């Protein structure tokens, strides 16, 4: 027995992006702080490209299917 | 009516599978279907090895006679007749590895 209108948070957290009721994504946004310049740039959780630090020109993120690996030790807050 | 689900073979995705010649009749049989039983054969019979061990020669790493490697491929037609796989009863037809 389960209510379909007041579903558990966990359950919906497991389900597939499009299966959840209100239906929302997983992607998020993050302020990255270069390993040098320090500049704080916003990068999308699913960047589809390599990202440079507009200050110096360092490498911050490498693209993948879904996740974006962050180059070396750079900082990252999840804006939400 | 229908007798089997796999009709004897395992072709599940593709439309065609390589054909292979029968170890016994020489007949052509689709790989997937034909019976197989790659066995580890021994060079000499039981009591007969001991006779070759004493009159043996070369070193003795305790590795004895190389065992024969026989990759066996039978087509249904003769596979049966050859005591390999006997006509099994109704519900036992779905049993795999008894």
């Amino acid at each position: 027995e389960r209510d379909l209108l007041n579903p558990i948070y966990e359950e919906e957290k497991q389900k597939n992006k499009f299966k959840r009721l209100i239906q929302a994504p997983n992607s998020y946004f993050m302020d990255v702080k270069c390993a040098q310049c320090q500049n704080i740039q916003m990068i999308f959780s699913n960047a589809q490209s390599t990202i440079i630090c507009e200050k110096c020109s360092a490498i911050l993120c490498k693209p993948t299917g879904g996740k974006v690996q962050i180059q070396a030790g750079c900082a990252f807050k999840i804006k939400n | 009516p229908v007798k089997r689900r796999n009709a004897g073979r395992s072709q599940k995705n593709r439309g065609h599978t390589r054909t292979v010649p029968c170890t016994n009749c020489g007949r052509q049989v689709a790989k997937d279907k034909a019976v197989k039983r790659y066995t580890v054969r021994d060079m000499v019979d039981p009591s007969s090895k001991r006779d070759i061990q004493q009159k043996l020669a070369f070193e003795n790493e305790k590795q004895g006679i190389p065992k024969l490697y026989v990759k066996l491929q039978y087509c249904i037609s003769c596979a049966i007749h050859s005591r390999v796989v006997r006509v099994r009863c109704a519900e036992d037809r779905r049993i795999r590895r008894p």
């Binding site: 992006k17 499009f18 994504p25 946004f29 916003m42 999308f44 960047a47 589809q48 990202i51 | -």
Partner: protein, 150 residues
């Protein structure tokens, strides 16, 4: 799932609920409109421009922030990409196929694939022409394609 009696799935993308613009961000519609048209001037697809504004400058959904869809913004600012991504690209690969086919005049799987791709293009023309979004005398044959190559 288009030209496919057998293959079919779900790529992704589901716009979040909250119809307003993200908190953290501050940018009068105009601010973006500049980036958008600037970026566009460099020669960009509204398809690609939006990608930047998401990956680079944290703007998830330009439409949600401006109250304007990219292509529209662009068209209002003269920076309109003549022929739509849709058609453009299909015709691009449609062409790439033809070139490859030449030196491989025997590659049958490719003859087929092109047949499908050329088929699509006729489907877009039918469409884009009906929305008076492309001159009626438009015709992709081989000259329409090579015409864009120049």
């Amino acid at each position: 799932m288009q030209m496919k009696g057998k293959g079919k799935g779900i790529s992704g993308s589901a716009l979040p609920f909250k119809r307003r613009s993200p908190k953290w961000l501050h940018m009068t519609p105009s601010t973006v409109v500049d980036l958008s048209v600037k970026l566009a001037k460099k020669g960009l697809t509204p398809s690609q421009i939006g990608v930047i504004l998401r990956d680079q400058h944290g703007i998830p959904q330009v439409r949600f922030l401006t109250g304007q869809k990219i292509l529209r913004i662009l068209k209002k600012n003269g920076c309109a990409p003549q022929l739509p991504e849709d058609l453009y690209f299909l015709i691009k690969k449609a062409l790439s196929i033809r070139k490859h086919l030449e030196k491989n005049r025997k590659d049958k799987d490719s003859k087929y694939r092109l047949i499908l791709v050329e088929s699509r293009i006729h489907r877009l023309s039918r469409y884009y022409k009906l929305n008076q979004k492309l001159p009626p005398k438009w015709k992709y044959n081989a000259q329409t394609a090579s015409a864009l190559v120049q």
